[PDB]
């Protein structure tokens, strides 16, 4: 049976991927420093799961972690963009050095396939208000966004120089159960859903006309598995957005209706780094992956709410 190394596997997206891989019969090895990930996210009783608690930028740890692994999904990163603005030096270790050290360890070990969580943040403000195609000029505005893009560039280098097979996925806005709502910079759906469940007010920054391309985590997991099992994945990046349009006001009304409870909306100012419109051009995604029928926003919110 094949073993998948999942860096960041104890986190939001990672733990769902772990469940899905194990269910398909893979062995899984999680490498996670539990900075935001949680052991309670993992099915620790599954005989197919191994857990290594440590830093994904640690070369000695990666040399151990890759031994006996057949492929990698590289999800470890400090996901809070704001955290990278606060401390560029520390987050650069997690957001880029981990990628570089993983490439070195995979090349030594002879492992080719790595699926990488890049981000729509690499586009910055370019193409705003239009479906963003993958060849849109990049404009990373924070250390996080620059490290995700630099990670792409190094993965492509190891592909050409050393025969790595990277599957570069630029996530748009992923949501669903286990997304941690504890920070003011947690994903807005995790925050809004937590308040609605508790019956407490939410805070809307700006006028609510901002749009995002929301993706339910279960649909992202399908793509991640397919990137692991593809016979010859494309070299260049693929957006993971649906090409959908959801305003924050759309989201407020959908969530309120799902909770069946009234929802107080207090106001805050638009946050300084807030992009107003964000939507993916889904054409490469639809060409390269089988999305089937994705979850609509309502279906995804419902599953999230019904889990809390």
Ligand X SMILES: NC(=O)c1ccc[n+]([C@@H]2O[C@H](COP(=O)([O-])OP(=O)(O)OC[C@H]3O[C@@H](n4cnc5c(N)ncnc54)[C@H](O)[C@@H]3O)[C@@H](O)[C@H]2O)c1
- Binding-site residue set: 12-13, 32-33, 35-37, 55-56, 75, 77, 94, 144, 148, 172-174, 188, 203, 205, 210, 212, 274
The entry of ligand X, ligand UD1, its own copies, none near residue 205 (CB within 5 to 8 angstroms by kind) is: ligand UD1
Question: Is residue 13 part of the contact set for ligand X (CB under 6 A)?
Answer: yes
Per the listing, tokens 């407020």 go with 252
Which among 218, 206, 149 is positioned nearest to 178, based on CA atoms?
A: 218
Query: If binding means CB under 6 A, how many residues of this protein chain bind ligand X?
Result: 31
- Asked if residues 169 and 223 have their Cβ atoms less than 8 Å apart, the reply is yes
Binds ligand X (CB under 6 A): choice among 4, 17, 42, 94: 94
Q: Cα-flanking dihedrals φ and ψ of residue 67, to 5°?
A: -65, 120
Structure tokens, 261? 């409870």
Minimum Å distance from CB 161 to ligand X? 20
According to DSSP, the β-strands at 3-7 and 27-32 are parallel
* Stretch 261-290 residues interacting with ligand X (CB under 6 A): none
Q: Which of 26, 123, 144, 216 is catalytic?
A: 144
> Which residues are registered as beta bridge partners of 32?
53
User: Which letter does DSSP use for residue 94 in this model?
Assistant: I
Q: Exactly one of 4, 5, 6, 8 binds ligand X (CB under 6 A); which one?
A: 8
83 binds, among its own copies, ligand UD1, ligand X, none (CB under 5 to 8 A by kind): none
CB closer to its own copies, 17 vs 164? 164
Would residue 216 show up in a list of annotated catalytic residues for this protein? no
Residues that bind ligand UD1 (CB under 6 A): 173, 185, 187-188, 191, 203-205, 210, 212, 248, 271, 274, 278
Smallest distance, Å, CB 74 to ligand X?
7
**Under rule CB under 6 A, residue 66 binds ligand X:** no
Binding site partner of 191, from ligand UD1, ligand X, its own copies, none, Cβ cut-off 5-8 A by kind = ligand UD1
Distance CA 67, CA 3 (A): 10
Nearer to its own copies, 78 or 174 (CB): 78
Residue 94 or 259: which CB sits closer to ligand X? 94
Q: Hey, which bits of 133-264 come out as E strands?
A: 165-171, 173-175, 202-205, 211-212, 214-216, 238-240, 246-247
Distance CA 118, CA 52 (A): 23
Q: In this structure, how many other beta carbons lie within 10 angstroms of the beta carbon of residue 181? A: 16
Instruction: Quote the CA–CA distance of 138 and 280 in Å, as a whole number.
Output: 14
HSE-up of residue 218 (Cα within 13 Å, Cβ side): 12
Residue 115: phi and psi, rounded to 5, are -95, 125
85 binds, among ligand X, ligand UD1, its own copies, none (CB under 5 to 8 A by kind): its own copies
- Provide the annotated active-site residues: 144
Q: Which residues bind ligand X (CB under 6 A)?
A: 7-8, 10-14, 31-37, 55-57, 75-79, 94, 98, 117, 119, 171, 173-174, 180, 187
């Amino acid at each position: 049976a094949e073993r998948i190394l999942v860096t960041g596997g104890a986190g939001f997206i990672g733990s769902h991927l772990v469940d899905a891989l194990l269910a398909k019969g893979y062995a899984v090895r999680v490498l996670d420093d539990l900075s935001t990930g949680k052991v309670g996210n993992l099915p620790m009783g599954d005989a197919g799961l191994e857990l290594l608690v440590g830093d994904a930028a640690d070369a000695a740890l990666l040399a151990d972690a890759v031994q006996g692994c057949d492929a990698v999904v590289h999800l470890a990163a400090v996901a809070s963009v704001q955290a990278s603005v606060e401390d560029p030096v520390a987050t650069h270790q997690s957001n880029f050095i981990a990628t570089l050290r993983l490439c070195e360890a995979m090349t030594a070990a002879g492992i080719r396939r790595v699926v990488f969580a890049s981000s729509a943040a690499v586009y910055g403000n370019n193409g705003e208000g239009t479906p963003i195609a993958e060849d849109t000029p990049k404009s990373p505005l924070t250390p996080y966004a620059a490290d995700k893009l630099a990670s792409e560039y190094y993965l492509d280098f190891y592909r050409r120089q050393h025969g790595l097979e990277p599957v570069i996925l630029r996530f748009f806005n992923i949501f669903g159960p286990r997304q941690d709502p504890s920070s003011p910079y947690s994903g807005v759906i995790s925050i809004f859903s937590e308040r609605a469940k508790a019956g407490r007010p939410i805070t809307l920054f700006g006028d609510g006309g901002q749009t995002r391309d929301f993706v339910y985590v279960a649909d992202l997991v399908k793509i991640l598995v397919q990137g692991l099992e593809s016979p010859a994945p494309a070299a260049d990046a693929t957006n993971v957005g649906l090409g959908g349009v959801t305003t924050l006001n759309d989201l407020i009304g959908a969530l309120q209706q799902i909770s069946g409870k009234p929802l107080q909306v207090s106001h805050g100012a638009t946050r300084s780094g807030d992009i107003r419109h964000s939507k993916a051009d889904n054409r490469r995604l639809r060409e390269r992956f089988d999305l089937g029928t994705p979850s609509s926003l309502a279906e995804g919110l419902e599953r999230l709410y019904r889990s809390l």
